[PDB]
Amino acid sequence: AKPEIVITYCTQCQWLLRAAWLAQELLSTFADDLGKVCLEPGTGGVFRITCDGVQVWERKADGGFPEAKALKQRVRDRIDPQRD
Amino acid sequence: AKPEIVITYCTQCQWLLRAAWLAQELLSTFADDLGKVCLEPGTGGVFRITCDGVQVWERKADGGFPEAKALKQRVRDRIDPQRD
Amino acid sequence: AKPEIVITYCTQCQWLLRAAWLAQELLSTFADDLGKVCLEPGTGGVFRITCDGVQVWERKADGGFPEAKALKQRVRDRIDPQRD
Amino acid sequence: AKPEIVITYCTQCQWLLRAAWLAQELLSTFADDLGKVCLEPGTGGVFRITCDGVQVWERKADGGFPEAKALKQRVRDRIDPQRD
């Protein structure tokens, strides 16, 4: 089974949009290397992204929201270390 | 555990777009009743949607792709039978 | 100038999602042949699509909402008659 | 006519996704105050956003891509100065 990505986003905060945008950014560049990307509704300003359980991004810790390039780089390092 | 929706789409067919559109259609109308909606890359003209493992749509069987309303109705019937 | 596509959608009806989905479907298959695709907030059950002013789709007339292939075919015929 | 937003994006760069994402971010928070948001295919690393002709963002000048909040703030200042 291929790596699973989970994007937990605050629904009341209207973060579905950016969450689905990032999911598509990932699914289009790692179409072959990803098992599936899940969007998980959450609450309280939550915005976290995990790869096979390992946190790859969290709003507070990383200070905001990821640029597509930065997020792809972090997923690349965990899924396919060597990949330009 | 809230109901999990899985959308398996053909990547080579360029169906990511419509798959992410339907995922957002679902997440915005069932934000509180859905555990998570997953997009799962597949192949060979596949386009299937499951709710807690139960098939709610399949390209061939249902003849094409779902209208948002139709898909929401099928998910409603399984997740919240009584809901206008 | 290149052909301009306008998608007028009912905002209260929550049709922004499907409107943006169709806009992307069009911009990704006709990237070189389209001047620009516009999303225009409308009211009251409105869902109309025009190509250089010529109606290419409306809800009542066409009975619902377009499948991607159908809409692309209609834009094809007006923008590049001969094209698969 | 209401303010028109134009998002010029580099097609070869695969920036349609992020362009459509920002368009939706804008259309959902300014549904009533915007005439229409247009996505305009471009080239050569372009990423520009204008409001009634006035540049509200440009990749090089502003150094990268806008956060939804930042972009909404800039459109707010030009379209409805006083608004939270």
Domains of chain A (ranges plus CATH)? Answer: 1-84 (3.40.30.10)
C23: helix, coil or strand? helix
Q: What are phi and psi of C74, to 5 degrees?
A: -65, -35
**Residue D12 burial (C-beta neighbours within 10 Å; 0-12, 13-18, 19+):** exposed
HEC profile of chain D: CCCEEEEEEECCCCCHHHHHHHHHHHHHHCCCCCCEEEEEEECCCCEEEEECCEEEEEHHHHCCCCCHHHHHHHHHHHHCCCCC
Residues B74 and B51: their CA atoms lie apart, in Å, by: 10
Which three-class secondary structure state does DSSP give residue C38?
A: strand
Contact in structure between B16 and A27 (CB atoms under 8 Å): yes
> DSSP readout, B56-79?
EEEHHHHTS---HHHHHHHHHHHH
Residue D13 corresponds to which tokens in the numbers above? 């760069």
Which letter, b or e, does each residue of A20-42 get, where b requires 16 or more Cβ atoms within 10 Å of its Cβ?
bbbbbbbbbbbeeebebbbbbbb
| PDB resolution in Å | 2.5
* Distance separating alpha carbons of residues A13 and B56, to the nearest angstrom: 29
CA distance linking residue A25 with residue A19, whole number of Å = 10
Coil vs helix vs strand at A83: coil
Q: Which amino acid is at B38?
A: C
Crossing angle (nearest 10°) for helices A16-29 and B16-29: 160
Do D23 and C6 count as a contact with CB atoms less than 8 A apart?
no
B47-51, strands of its sheet edge to edge: A54-58, A47-51, A4-10, A36-42, B36-42, B4-10, B47-51, B54-58
Residues from chain A contacting residue D17 (CB–CB below 8 Å): 21, 24-25, 28, 68
**Do residues D75 and D33 make contact, with C-beta atoms less than 8 angstroms apart?**
no
Question: What proportions of chain C, in percent to the nearest 5, are helix, strand and coil?
Answer: 35, 30, 35
- Rg for chain A (alpha carbons), in Å? 12
- Name residue B51's beta-bridge partners: B5, B54
Helix (H, G, I), strand (E, B) or coil at C27: helix
CB atoms within 10 A of CB A77: 13
Question: Hey, which chains touch B, using 3+ CB pairs under 8 Å?
Answer: A, C
Residue A63 and residue B62: Cα distance in Å, rounded? Answer: 45
A 43-82 residues inside an 8 A Cβ radius of D: 64-65, 67-68
Q: Which residues of chain C make contact with B68, given a CB cutoff of 8 A?
A: 17-18, 65
Q: Which method, experimentally, gave rise to this model?
A: X-ray
CA–CA separation, B46 and B63 (whole Å): 12
In angstroms, the separation between the Cα of residue D66 and the nearest Cα of chain C is 19
- Residue to mutate among B18, B28, B59, B62, with most C CBs inside 10 A, is B18
* B10 in contact with A, Cβ within 8 Å: no
Q: What is the Rg, in whole angstroms, of the alpha carbon atoms belonging to chain D? A: 12
Distance from CA of C24 to the nearest CA of B (A): 8
3-class state of residue B42 by DSSP: strand
Whether residues A68 and D21 touch (CB distance < 8 A) is answered with no
Partners of D8 in the β-ladder: D40, D48
Return the amino acid letter for C51. Answer: C
Q: Is residue C45 within 8 Å of residue C63, measured between CB atoms?
A: no
The burial of D62, by beta-carbon neighbours within 10 Å (0-12 exposed, 13-18 middle, 19 or more buried), is given as middle
Instruction: Give the separation between CA D10 and CA D14, rounded to whole angstroms.
Output: 7
